[PDB]
Amino acid sequence: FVNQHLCGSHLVEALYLVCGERGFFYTPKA
Amino acid sequence: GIVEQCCASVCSLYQLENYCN
Ligand code: NI
């Protein structure tokens, strides 16, 4: 695997791919 | 946080797994 530059909706897409049915929390800073 | 690191810098898929449930 390689490192990634992920902003906005692209980060959410990656979380979805990584976590799949486990689900995930998307928790941005204030 | 991660949202921030991945965007301002870079992050790995392994770091993202930290956010799975
Ligand atoms: Ni885009």
- Any residues with CB less than 8 A from the CB of A14 and at least 6 apart, and which? A4, A6, B6, B13, B16
Q: How far does residue B7's CA lie from ligand 1's centre (Å)? A: 12
Documented resolution in Å? 1.5
Q: How far does residue A4's CA lie from ligand 1's centre (Å)? A: 13
| Dist. CA A4–CA B17, nearest whole Å | 14
3-state helix, strand, coil in chain B (%, to 5): 65, 10, 25
Q: Which of A3, A5, A23 sits opposite B21 (nearest CB)?
A: A23
Q: Cβ separation of B13 and A6 shorter than 8 Å? A: no
DSSP B11: B
| Dist. CA A21–CA B4, nearest whole Å | 24
Method by which the coordinates were obtained: X-ray
Query: What is the three-class DSSP state of B20?
Result: strand
Angle at B3 between CA A7 and CA A16, to 5 degrees: 80
HSE of A12 in the Cβ direction (CA atoms, 13 Å)?
5
Chain B: give the shortest CA distance to residue A24, in Å: 4
Give yes or no for a contact between B14 and A18, defined as CB atoms under 8 angstroms apart: no
Domains of chain A, by residue range, sit at 1-30
